[PDB]
Write a protein that holds these residues in place. Structure first.
Motif, PDB file in Angstrom:
ATOM      1  N   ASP A 102       0.847  -1.184   0.000  1.00  0.00           N
ATOM      2  CA  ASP A 102       0.000   0.000   0.000  1.00  0.00           C
ATOM      3  C   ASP A 102       0.881   1.231   0.000  1.00  0.00           C
ATOM      4  O   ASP A 102       0.400   2.357   0.043  1.00  0.00           O
ATOM      5  CB  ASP A 102      -0.892   0.017   1.237  1.00  0.00           C
ATOM      6  CG  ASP A 102      -2.153  -0.796   1.052  1.00  0.00           C
ATOM      7  OD1 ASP A 102      -2.946  -0.464   0.139  1.00  0.00           O
ATOM      8  OD2 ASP A 102      -2.351  -1.763   1.816  1.00  0.00           O
ATOM      9  N   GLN A 103       2.183   0.989  -0.046  1.00  0.00           N
ATOM     10  CA  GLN A 103       3.197   2.033  -0.034  1.00  0.00           C
ATOM     11  C   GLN A 103       4.051   1.785  -1.280  1.00  0.00           C
ATOM     12  O   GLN A 103       4.511   0.665  -1.501  1.00  0.00           O
ATOM     13  CB  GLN A 103       4.040   1.886   1.246  1.00  0.00           C
ATOM     14  CG  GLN A 103       5.182   2.892   1.428  1.00  0.00           C
ATOM     15  CD  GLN A 103       6.114   2.536   2.598  1.00  0.00           C
ATOM     16  OE1 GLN A 103       6.831   1.526   2.562  1.00  0.00           O
ATOM     17  NE2 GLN A 103       6.106   3.370   3.639  1.00  0.00           N
ATOM     18  N   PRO A 104       4.271   2.821  -2.112  1.00  0.00           N
ATOM     19  CA  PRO A 104       5.073   2.659  -3.323  1.00  0.00           C
ATOM     20  C   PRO A 104       6.359   1.863  -3.137  1.00  0.00           C
ATOM     21  O   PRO A 104       7.013   1.952  -2.111  1.00  0.00           O
ATOM     22  CB  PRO A 104       5.327   4.097  -3.759  1.00  0.00           C
ATOM     23  CG  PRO A 104       5.232   4.862  -2.509  1.00  0.00           C
ATOM     24  CD  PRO A 104       4.029   4.248  -1.867  1.00  0.00           C
ATOM     25  N   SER A 105       6.695   1.082  -4.156  1.00  0.00           N
ATOM     26  CA  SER A 105       7.878   0.233  -4.185  1.00  0.00           C
ATOM     27  C   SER A 105       9.169   1.038  -4.035  1.00  0.00           C
ATOM     28  O   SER A 105       9.268   2.163  -4.529  1.00  0.00           O
ATOM     29  CB  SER A 105       7.888  -0.546  -5.502  1.00  0.00           C
ATOM     30  OG  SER A 105       8.936  -1.495  -5.547  1.00  0.00           O
TER      31      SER A 105
ATOM     32  N   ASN B  51      11.049  16.162  -7.631  1.00  0.00           N
ATOM     33  CA  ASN B  51      10.521  14.984  -6.952  1.00  0.00           C
ATOM     34  C   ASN B  51       9.012  15.077  -6.808  1.00  0.00           C
ATOM     35  O   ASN B  51       8.492  16.016  -6.217  1.00  0.00           O
ATOM     36  CB  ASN B  51      11.141  14.838  -5.569  1.00  0.00           C
ATOM     37  CG  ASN B  51      10.973  13.447  -5.016  1.00  0.00           C
ATOM     38  OD1 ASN B  51       9.917  12.834  -5.175  1.00  0.00           O
ATOM     39  ND2 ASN B  51      12.013  12.933  -4.364  1.00  0.00           N
ATOM     40  N   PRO B  52       8.288  14.091  -7.339  1.00  0.00           N
ATOM     41  CA  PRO B  52       6.827  14.093  -7.257  1.00  0.00           C
ATOM     42  C   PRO B  52       6.219  13.336  -6.071  1.00  0.00           C
ATOM     43  O   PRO B  52       4.995  13.291  -5.929  1.00  0.00           O
ATOM     44  CB  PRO B  52       6.437  13.471  -8.580  1.00  0.00           C
ATOM     45  CG  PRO B  52       7.491  12.403  -8.724  1.00  0.00           C
ATOM     46  CD  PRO B  52       8.761  13.098  -8.321  1.00  0.00           C
ATOM     47  N   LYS B  53       7.063  12.746  -5.225  1.00  0.00           N
ATOM     48  CA  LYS B  53       6.580  11.968  -4.084  1.00  0.00           C
ATOM     49  C   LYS B  53       5.440  12.649  -3.367  1.00  0.00           C
ATOM     50  O   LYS B  53       4.275  12.334  -3.623  1.00  0.00           O
ATOM     51  CB  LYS B  53       7.705  11.690  -3.092  1.00  0.00           C
ATOM     52  CG  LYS B  53       7.369  10.591  -2.077  1.00  0.00           C
ATOM     53  CD  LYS B  53       7.155  11.128  -0.654  1.00  0.00           C
ATOM     54  CE  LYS B  53       8.453  11.682  -0.051  1.00  0.00           C
ATOM     55  NZ  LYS B  53       8.259  12.489   1.197  1.00  0.00           N
ATOM     56  N   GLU B  54       5.763  13.586  -2.479  1.00  0.00           N
ATOM     57  CA  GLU B  54       4.732  14.294  -1.719  1.00  0.00           C
ATOM     58  C   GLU B  54       3.559  14.679  -2.611  1.00  0.00           C
ATOM     59  O   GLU B  54       2.405  14.633  -2.198  1.00  0.00           O
ATOM     60  CB  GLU B  54       5.312  15.550  -1.052  1.00  0.00           C
ATOM     61  CG  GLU B  54       6.088  15.299   0.261  1.00  0.00           C
ATOM     62  CD  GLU B  54       5.239  14.646   1.376  1.00  0.00           C
ATOM     63  OE1 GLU B  54       4.052  15.012   1.539  1.00  0.00           O
ATOM     64  OE2 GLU B  54       5.768  13.773   2.104  1.00  0.00           O
ATOM     65  N   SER B  55       3.879  15.031  -3.848  1.00  0.00           N
ATOM     66  CA  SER B  55       2.895  15.431  -4.841  1.00  0.00           C
ATOM     67  C   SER B  55       1.872  14.346  -5.146  1.00  0.00           C
ATOM     68  O   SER B  55       0.670  14.551  -4.996  1.00  0.00           O
ATOM     69  CB  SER B  55       3.619  15.836  -6.128  1.00  0.00           C
ATOM     70  OG  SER B  55       2.703  16.110  -7.175  1.00  0.00           O
TER      71      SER B  55
ATOM     72  N   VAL C   7      -5.772   1.537  -5.014  1.00  0.00           N
ATOM     73  CA  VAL C   7      -4.470   2.180  -4.873  1.00  0.00           C
ATOM     74  C   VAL C   7      -3.290   1.260  -5.094  1.00  0.00           C
ATOM     75  O   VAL C   7      -2.332   1.633  -5.747  1.00  0.00           O
ATOM     76  CB  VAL C   7      -4.316   2.857  -3.488  1.00  0.00           C
ATOM     77  CG1 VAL C   7      -2.869   3.282  -3.268  1.00  0.00           C
ATOM     78  CG2 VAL C   7      -5.247   4.072  -3.394  1.00  0.00           C
ATOM     79  N   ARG C   8      -3.334   0.059  -4.549  1.00  0.00           N
ATOM     80  CA  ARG C   8      -2.206  -0.822  -4.768  1.00  0.00           C
ATOM     81  C   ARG C   8      -2.055  -1.053  -6.272  1.00  0.00           C
ATOM     82  O   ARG C   8      -0.964  -0.902  -6.815  1.00  0.00           O
ATOM     83  CB  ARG C   8      -2.397  -2.141  -4.017  1.00  0.00           C
ATOM     84  CG  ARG C   8      -2.351  -2.003  -2.501  1.00  0.00           C
ATOM     85  CD  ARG C   8      -2.831  -3.274  -1.854  1.00  0.00           C
ATOM     86  NE  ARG C   8      -2.771  -3.248  -0.398  1.00  0.00           N
ATOM     87  CZ  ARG C   8      -3.197  -4.245   0.373  1.00  0.00           C
ATOM     88  NH1 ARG C   8      -3.713  -5.343  -0.179  1.00  0.00           N
ATOM     89  NH2 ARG C   8      -3.113  -4.149   1.695  1.00  0.00           N
ATOM     90  N   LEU C   9      -3.148  -1.399  -6.948  1.00  0.00           N
ATOM     91  CA  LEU C   9      -3.092  -1.630  -8.384  1.00  0.00           C
ATOM     92  C   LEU C   9      -2.467  -0.389  -8.999  1.00  0.00           C
ATOM     93  O   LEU C   9      -1.537  -0.475  -9.796  1.00  0.00           O
ATOM     94  CB  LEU C   9      -4.506  -1.865  -8.948  1.00  0.00           C
ATOM     95  CG  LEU C   9      -4.657  -2.062 -10.463  1.00  0.00           C
ATOM     96  CD1 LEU C   9      -3.955  -3.306 -10.857  1.00  0.00           C
ATOM     97  CD2 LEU C   9      -6.097  -2.162 -10.874  1.00  0.00           C
TER      98      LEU C   9
ATOM     99  N   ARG D   7       1.312  -0.185  -8.446  1.00  0.00           N
ATOM    100  CA  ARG D   7       1.773  -1.331  -9.216  1.00  0.00           C
ATOM    101  C   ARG D   7       1.921  -0.981 -10.686  1.00  0.00           C
ATOM    102  O   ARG D   7       2.997  -1.129 -11.255  1.00  0.00           O
ATOM    103  CB  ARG D   7       0.801  -2.505  -9.092  1.00  0.00           C
ATOM    104  CG  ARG D   7       1.268  -3.796  -9.783  1.00  0.00           C
ATOM    105  CD  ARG D   7       0.137  -4.834  -9.848  1.00  0.00           C
ATOM    106  NE  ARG D   7       0.628  -6.206  -9.776  1.00  0.00           N
ATOM    107  CZ  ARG D   7       1.137  -6.878 -10.799  1.00  0.00           C
ATOM    108  NH1 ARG D   7       1.217  -6.309 -11.992  1.00  0.00           N
ATOM    109  NH2 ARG D   7       1.579  -8.116 -10.627  1.00  0.00           N
ATOM    110  N   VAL D   8       0.849  -0.509 -11.307  1.00  0.00           N
ATOM    111  CA  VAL D   8       0.952  -0.187 -12.716  1.00  0.00           C
ATOM    112  C   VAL D   8       2.037   0.843 -12.967  1.00  0.00           C
ATOM    113  O   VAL D   8       3.063   0.529 -13.558  1.00  0.00           O
ATOM    114  CB  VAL D   8      -0.362   0.316 -13.280  1.00  0.00           C
ATOM    115  CG1 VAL D   8      -0.159   0.755 -14.716  1.00  0.00           C
ATOM    116  CG2 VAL D   8      -1.385  -0.791 -13.223  1.00  0.00           C
TER     117      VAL D   8
END
Lengths: 326, 114
Positions: A16-19, A32-36, A72-74, A77-78
């Protein structure tokens, strides 16, 4: 195989948290787009969970959270896959432009939620496609842009689930794309005041013709076996309408134009084709709905019968273009 | 009376050959051509057209009708209105806006078979 089960499995066992690897990407962007992207998911969350509950019974918020959560996970993932299958072709490893693009995420996420939502769907006050777009405040056209790329970035899509999106894509091209106040228009104009923008709109058009035509064919064969040379004179009118008189599609349906093109061309050539049969045949096509030729936009929010659309709008607008066929 | 005189006089300005004379349909196919080519901007036929019309209609008459004693092919064409005053474009527009208009009405509704 790619069983509906196989997918449900990968989703459940997904993070549920990005890889960590999908973050390497964030960290290689000019910005950096993280927080975004991360703040997005969260904000969208409430918006979805709620505009979901306020449309499905009550007491069942759990399922809501679940669907989005899983959606969200999907989603992540994609994206990763979608990013890896982009580093390769078009070598680069950066990707700032894309990952910071609101609409991108807004569309990718949508599509997942649509796919997640539609597999756990046997149960469920129905949210089949059209829905999701009005929830995320997402425009049909834009959603369409991610469909092809999406189906290819996930091999765990069931053969059905895929057709579901293909249908969606097919629906956006026949009407949704052309809904009132949709970027499809405002975009087209701009391409007539500075060509060579990018392979996209011209591509969309490409896929459209592929669609329209075949229907036009289906009908032309039945209702016009004799003298087939017309099949191509109608298509021309048709294209011309799409290309030069596109505005005529605003809040209308491809099929609506095809037919009128059929009628009007058979009418300047003095031909046995009565709108009666045209519409009669039109019902046999694997999707058509009587609603398509009974309710046709005319003036403001006023709809009447295809015929009226014809005599009061079609016939009148591309009148001149037709008269040079008599 | 003066019919045979108007004959050539009409086949003339119509641009057709006196060897496909009484053929009203083929004469109409022509007459219409002379319309899709008239422009009160290249032509001053405003008078040389007023005749192009008057005569032709006087020759169509001999066919467009269904006779009490019902013999002869059936007409069913449209209607080339006497072109008297109405401005050529308002006329020419009118005419097509018709050969292109749908005077039908949608059908009843669903079925009932099994």
């Amino acid at each position: 195989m790619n069983t509906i089960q196989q997918l449900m499995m990968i989703l459940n066992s997904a993070s549920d948290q990005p890889s960590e690897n999908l973050i390497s990407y964030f960290n290689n962007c000019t910005v950096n787009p993280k927080e975004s992207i991360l703040k997005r998911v969260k904000d969208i969350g409430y918006i979805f969970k709620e505009k979901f509950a306020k449309a499905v019974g009550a007491g069942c918020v759990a399922i809501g959270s679940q669907r989005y959560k899983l959606g969200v996970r999907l989603y992540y993932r994609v994206m990763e896959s979608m990013l890896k299958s982009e580093e390769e072709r078009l070598s680069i490893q950066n990707f700032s432009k894309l990952l910071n693009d609101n609409i991108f995420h807004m569309s990718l996420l949508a599509c997942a939620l649509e796919v997640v939502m539609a597999t756990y769907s046997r149960s469920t006050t129905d949210l089949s496609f059209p829905w999701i777009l009005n929830v995320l405040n997402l425009k049909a056209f834009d959603f369409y842009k991610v469909i092809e790329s999406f189906i290819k970035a996930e091999g765990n899509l069931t053969r059905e689930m895929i057709k579901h999106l293909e249908r969606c894509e097919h629906r956006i091209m026949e009407s949704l794309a052309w809904l009132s106040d949709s970027p499809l228009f405002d975009l087209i104009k701009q391409s007539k005041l500075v060509p060579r923008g990018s392979t996209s709109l011209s591509l969309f058009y490409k896929k459209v013709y592929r669609l329209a035509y075949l229907r036009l064919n289906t009908l032309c064969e039945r209702l016009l076996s004799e003298h087939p040379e017309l099949e191509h004179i109608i298509w021309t009118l048709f294209q011309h309408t799409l290309q030069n008189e596109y505005e005529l599609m605003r809040d209308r349906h491809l099929d609506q134009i095809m037919m009128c093109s059929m009628y009007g061309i058979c009418k300047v050539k003095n031909i046995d084709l009565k709108f009666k049969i045209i519409v009669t045949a039109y019902k046999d096509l694997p999707h058509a709905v009587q609603e398509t030729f009974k309710r046709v936009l005319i003036k403001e929010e006023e709809y009447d019968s295809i015929i009226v659309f014809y005599n009061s709008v079609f016939m009148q607008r591309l009148k001149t273009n037709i008269l040079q066929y008599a | 009376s003066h019919m045979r005189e108007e004959s050539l006089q009409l086949m003339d300005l119509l641009g057709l050959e006196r060897s496909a004379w009484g053929n009203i349909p083929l004469m109409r196919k022509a007459y219409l051509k002379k319309c899709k080519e008239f422009h009160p901007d290249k032509g001053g036929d405003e008078e040389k057209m007023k005749k192009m019309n008057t005569l032709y209609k006087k020759m169509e008459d001999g066919v467009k009708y269904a006779h009490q004693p019902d013999f002869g092919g059936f007409w069913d064409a449209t209607e080339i209105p006497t072109y008297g005053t109405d401005e050529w474009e308002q006329w020419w527009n009118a005419f097509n806006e018709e050969n292109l208009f749908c005077s039908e009405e949608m059908p009843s509704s669903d079925d009932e078979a099994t």
